[PDB]
Design a protein around this ligand. Sequence first.
Ligand code: SF4
Ligand code: SF4
Ligand code: FES
Ligand code: FES
Ligand SMILES: [Fe+2]
Ligand SMILES: [Fe+2]
Lengths: 633, 633
Amino acid sequence: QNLKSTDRAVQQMLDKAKREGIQTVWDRYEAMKPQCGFGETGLCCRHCLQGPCRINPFGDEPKVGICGATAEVIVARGLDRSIAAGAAGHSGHAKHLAHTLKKAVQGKAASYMIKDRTKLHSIAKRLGIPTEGQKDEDIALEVAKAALADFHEKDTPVLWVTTVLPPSRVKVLSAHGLIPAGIDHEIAEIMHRTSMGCDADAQNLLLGGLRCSLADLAGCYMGTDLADILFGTPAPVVTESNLGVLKADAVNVAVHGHNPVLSDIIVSVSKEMENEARAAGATGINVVGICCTGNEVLMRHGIPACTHSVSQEMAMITGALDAMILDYQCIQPSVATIAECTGTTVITTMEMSKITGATHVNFAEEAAVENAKQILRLAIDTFKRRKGKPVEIPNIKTKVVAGFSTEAIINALSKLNANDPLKPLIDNVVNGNIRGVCLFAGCNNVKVPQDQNFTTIARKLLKQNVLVVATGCGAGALMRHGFMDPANVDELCGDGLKAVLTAIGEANGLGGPLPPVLHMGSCVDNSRAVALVAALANRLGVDLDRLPVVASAAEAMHEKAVATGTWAVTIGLPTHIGVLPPITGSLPVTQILTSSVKDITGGYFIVELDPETAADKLLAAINERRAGLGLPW
Amino acid sequence: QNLKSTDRAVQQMLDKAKREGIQTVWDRYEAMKPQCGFGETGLCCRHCLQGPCRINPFGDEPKVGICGATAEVIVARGLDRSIAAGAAGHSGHAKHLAHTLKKAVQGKAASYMIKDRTKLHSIAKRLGIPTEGQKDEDIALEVAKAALADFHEKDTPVLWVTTVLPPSRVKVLSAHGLIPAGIDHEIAEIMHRTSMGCDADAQNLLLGGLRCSLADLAGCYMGTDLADILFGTPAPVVTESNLGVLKADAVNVAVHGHNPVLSDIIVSVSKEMENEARAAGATGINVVGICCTGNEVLMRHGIPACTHSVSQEMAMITGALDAMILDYQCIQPSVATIAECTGTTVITTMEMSKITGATHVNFAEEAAVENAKQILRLAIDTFKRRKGKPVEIPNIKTKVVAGFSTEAIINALSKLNANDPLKPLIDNVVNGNIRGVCLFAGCNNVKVPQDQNFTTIARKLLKQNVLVVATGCGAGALMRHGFMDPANVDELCGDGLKAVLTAIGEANGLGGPLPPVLHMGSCVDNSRAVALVAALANRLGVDLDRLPVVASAAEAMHEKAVATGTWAVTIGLPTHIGVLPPITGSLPVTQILTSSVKDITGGYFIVELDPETAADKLLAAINERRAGLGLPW
Ligand code: SF4
Ligand code: SF4
Ligand code: FES
Ligand code: FES
Ligand SMILES: [Fe+2]
Ligand SMILES: [Fe+2]
């Protein structure tokens, strides 16, 4: 099973699924092999009904599409559509939160309120919205209308791009025509230009993709901004992760998906229903996280993380998961059929994301508490049914310190230098105690033994004194293998990095270091890492493509991950991807994305499936950036 | 060659291309066979990097996607994305025209003006915009801002849906949640819901597709509305079609693509440059049309149509095509490589639609006349080079009567009944002289011998007294085979239909009938057919799904055609498609689209590749509608 996942609790559930004859994601993978090489390489097109068109990577015909589309065009068009799909997901989440905030401050949704008024005012100031003498509710209404305006064309560009990146970066992007005009505008323009008989020049197509990737960035940054207003900005928290956070004696309820608009309410209401759950013979309601909605309540409330991404079915295989409460994105639709075998009540809550065989509870912000109780009573009913059934919860969990929003990181640093908080970080970059910064991001992927790339690469970088930050299911991978436990600093970290982590931790009254890896939140919270990196750029007076900062989507899967890797390149970062995107069928596209884009944005992709080699390549990238700054390396 | 195209001028150019070794669309098709059956059936998914996933139509594994997506989900998600792509194209065209109108009335683009102020005021009234005491420029500014607002969410739904369909139809659609909230909003929501781990219920997915198809309808109707304001509403015109409209002695310039914003200006400026073209030894500039931008200048100015869709390369093979002026959509990118062999200057003009190897002239509405001269001087230079080269223009053309906008049709009818113009049409439906109405729409497709389905089905329907209207490359197919020539009424038409066509024609002072088929314009001008059909619904007090009206996308290709077929179903029409869409891999999806959707919208798809069988099925559909109205059939 270790060839499937390096997570020992997942291995145990894989053995249980095997002997119970429950098909898993890995079984469905094996049944798909060998996979189609045309699609793997990107040399397939179904953009009109003359297709499917495919092109032989090598050999004889077919060499070209029926309409005359070249391999270069076909590959670029497919990639563009994946970027637009990802942008649509992140920005649909953000749009949902914009409407929730508008409703909250119009008196239409009383379960929701402004919890972070400091963040509200700072966002308003960044956007140019006056706050002087204005009521919070009116400021928030203006912030929500600005969020919504950024979806369409108007007399300004997308402000959740142009107000979050340094002016020098905006200038470079504007010169190349890369600043988005409107989030949904760009998504639709991608779909138009990539339809049959439209754009057919690889460079032109790919510049459109870079622009649409900044619409994805805008959606991420908007989603984080609005979620912090509504639910509070994360601060350091301590909790646990992996399947052993489930409890046989409790009603186990997993929140799974992306949008905390629901999950945050579930957390509160589950507290109120403790007695209504004890009367059923439970000890309480034990809310646990899966995927990014789990990260959201982990960062804000310390809710323990059950599992992530590719291994989500394994939470059900324990037999102890009484409900799985779903919104949208990254939910394997298999959970609906597995639920029959495992006794789990699967519940969907969003109109545009249903699964045949699941129970649907329409959620409306106006009824949030009402809906939460309806959902949690179905969970309690399910716990009652498994009275006296054995369960198999692996007794495996890690300790997790998290909650490192950019504000939290700056506050932590400010204990060392109160009026120039970024300076102690920069000081230790210059003196070599911190070699550079690596963000791990994105998914797991069934093609890669689960977590293997994240942990192999992180170990090499930590030993070389790289400051490692993580989000999404990259944060999930590292947390489940001990990388968010300060007890593991001595083992994992180079002496320079250990010295900094200990200095900061002890100055925040800890008697111990910060954890080896800093958890910066959900996938939309990749925007927090952008906030930190742009704040360092502004303090140093240099653009992001001169900083010793890199990113790794080490086991990417979702179209969202492709969009996010692309905006990391577009804002100036060397960006590793550890699974093959469908680009190898065109050398000219590959050369643009891994080489000549450097001349446009300063970032570039590093496509590398071997994780030891990837770690070497990321270190070289960091160290080239150090050299360009005149720093030893 | 008759197995490739039924167009004899295309057959002649196919022989020339063969002996010159110029590869064509049909050669590239043959080189693609056998095509992938997974993609043909819709049983392939590449929506994340765990894929490609495919499902065997029959047999053993694979049976399901890696994430657990069923055949039903995979097929519905692929279809939804095609609908969103089509909507993006039609509505991107409309958006372009909204910005052009705004610029024109702000004094930013003096080559453009309000040419149809009656249409402007009628549109304003339909939208609820006051006109009483307001300047035209201010009315138009309000109309353009309303067009742009319909792309995003706001306090009203998409008005280019809710103000163009009868209230009873809107009510049915609203009850099912099918009215779009915003055009780009719906496109983006499609892309989100169809991404990995989101919507996974075939009915839910397909209802989203129906809603997005009405966003495509809104884009079409907006594009027609704005283009009529700017360039004039079509009235009856007489011209010619097919390759023989090219002239060896002239500078032949083809306008190709979709948006008339450019082409309309080319037509005017080419008139001004006649002398500058005679000085080069031409007789003049001979502007000809390809695809829908050709239809646009055909409908408004009588510009002759050179060719359409699948046969576009053949215009270049004559050797006499000095320039091909491109905007976007439905342009085979092969034209750029063929141009080297044929001496043709291929010019692109829109930033989001370039072709490697073409010459790019950035077009800006503010410089329109300037750009037009630059482009037309490159054309003249190319004519000079082919001095003394032989050309092979097939001496094959048809006569074409066209320009039947809905206003033109109503005015024609009003000669028989001035104050109740729709009544003579309804009278002849009731008495059987007109059996019903069929709209032919959409493309040609290399899978189908060119034009064969359109002409086979049209002949059967005309002999049965069906009133046939056509747009796009369906209009192109029929015009090139004589169906727009009144001289062919006796041969083609049933006695009842001939009697009506003659009665109307003679009352419009013609001494002859209307043509056998009424050309209603470009693809966006399918909206004109909706205007006519909704006007008949309102006069009769019944919804569209009780009228004896059907549609046929007899040789569909483009994602736009899929979107348009879907909104034809959604507004209540039996809708034939004559090529296989990628749905046969899921029986449940097929049954929804061809059967149970009747219970939702009253329309339905008729998937039928044999054209004689298709004509029978369309007649049965018409005659079932007649019976439901109590009419003989
Ligand atoms: S757009 Fe061109 S390459 Fe793609 S399926 Fe259609 S003919 Fe083939
Ligand atoms: S979304 Fe599911 S079916 Fe599609 S490629 Fe990814 S794993 Fe396969
Ligand atoms: S030929 Fe396999 S992805 Fe299309
Ligand atoms: S397996 Fe051929 S279209 Fe994907
Ligand atoms: Fe996520
Ligand atoms: Fe068209």
